[PDB]
Design a protein around this ligand. Structure first.
Ligand code: CU
Ligand code: CU
Lengths: 119, 130, 130
């Protein structure tokens, strides 16, 4: 996720070019200096490290675990979308689903054509 | 940074900067995705150093070594000044021998009548005939 | 005369000689059964003069024109004389340039401690820090 891409671009100590200009960038409702980004990219890390622990808190769908889900979301919903790089983040779903989906189809290709089955 | 703004700040032009980067004479500036060479205050002062280095007389190579000096915060003012002084000496030799040449030219020319003649004594002093 | 002949007599090397030839500085020599350039005293004189255009410091072009004047006896001693004067003017330019900026190198020497300090102020004035 965006924290990963922001460290990958910060892998070699430096960048202020366009690919950061897409990133988090809260508009006060545009080159980005280090300290501002390092701050905006930090309380998100805090929401993660305090969020990923409650996923197991008596289930994926626990009250306060969903509170940290919805709160991480609300933490993001003040912010805006991030650049065409984020395209691959969506692809990382499709290329999974494209595969997963396909396997179901494949299983059906193995289950549904030769023998009879109910529908 | 904006590459034209940088080249005007240092007085150079972009292909000059690019020539110097081709010769590995500064810190590498990144590009942007569009391809704009990401210069810096680091590249600002590297380029100003590399600028005045040759106006002083340091070639592409030794001026690259000067940007090495700057990029070396471990640097030693001694060797810097020793090379400054070796340069002084080479300029001295240059001056001396250029003026020896000058003196020979002047001995040739004042020896000439300049009498719009076929009898140009200079050239026949220069040519190995007669 | 083969190229070794005028080369080892006047003293120039085969590369510089054929370079001067294809440059058109010098007369196209006669040629052989095999196209080897059988030079003559013409070319020997031309090439001694062409050197003493070089060693004197004329560029290749003005040097070619020196040798063209020589075998063109309608030349004027005055023209060669003013040429030498203009060349010595350029020598005065080159030498006073070196003198001035070397005086400034000496000022640089005066400024630096040269004491193995990574606060070498030379790098600090060139690299426009602060
Ligand atoms: Cu004359
Ligand atoms: Cu010093």
């Amino acid at each position: 996720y965006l924290l990963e891409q922001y460290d990958r671009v910060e892998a070699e100590e430096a960048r202020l070019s366009d690919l950061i200009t897409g990133f988090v960038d809260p508009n006060a409702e545009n080159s980005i200096d280090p300290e501002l980004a390092r701050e905006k990219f930090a309380e998100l890390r805090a929401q993660y490290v305090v969020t990923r622990d409650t996923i197991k808190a008596k289930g994926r769908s626990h009250a306060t675990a969903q509170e940290e889900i919805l709160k991480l979301s609300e933490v993001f919903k003040q912010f805006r979308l991030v650049p065409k790089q984020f395209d691959y983040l969506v692809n990382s779903m499709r290329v999974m689903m494209d595969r997963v989906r396909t396997q179901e189809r494949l299983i059906m290709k193995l289950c549904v054509e030769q023998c009879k089955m109910p529908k | 940074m904006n590459i034209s703004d940088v080249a005007k700040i240092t007085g150079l032009t972009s292909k000059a900067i690019r020539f110097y980067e081709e010769k590995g004479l500064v810190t590498p500036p990144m590009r942007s995705e569009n391809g704009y060479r990401t210069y810096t205050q680091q590249h600002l002062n590297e380029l100003t150093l590399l600028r005045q280095a040759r106006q002083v007389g340091f070639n592409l190579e030794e001026s690259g070594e000067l940007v090495n000096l700057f990029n070396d915060p471990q640097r030693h003012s001694a060797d810097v000044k020793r090379r400054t002084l070796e340069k002084v000496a080479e300029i001295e030799r240059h001056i001396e021998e250029l003026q020896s040449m000058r003196d020979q030219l002047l001995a040739l020319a004042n020896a000439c009548p300049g009498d719009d003649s076929a009898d140009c004594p200079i050239i026949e002093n220069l040519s190995g005939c007669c």
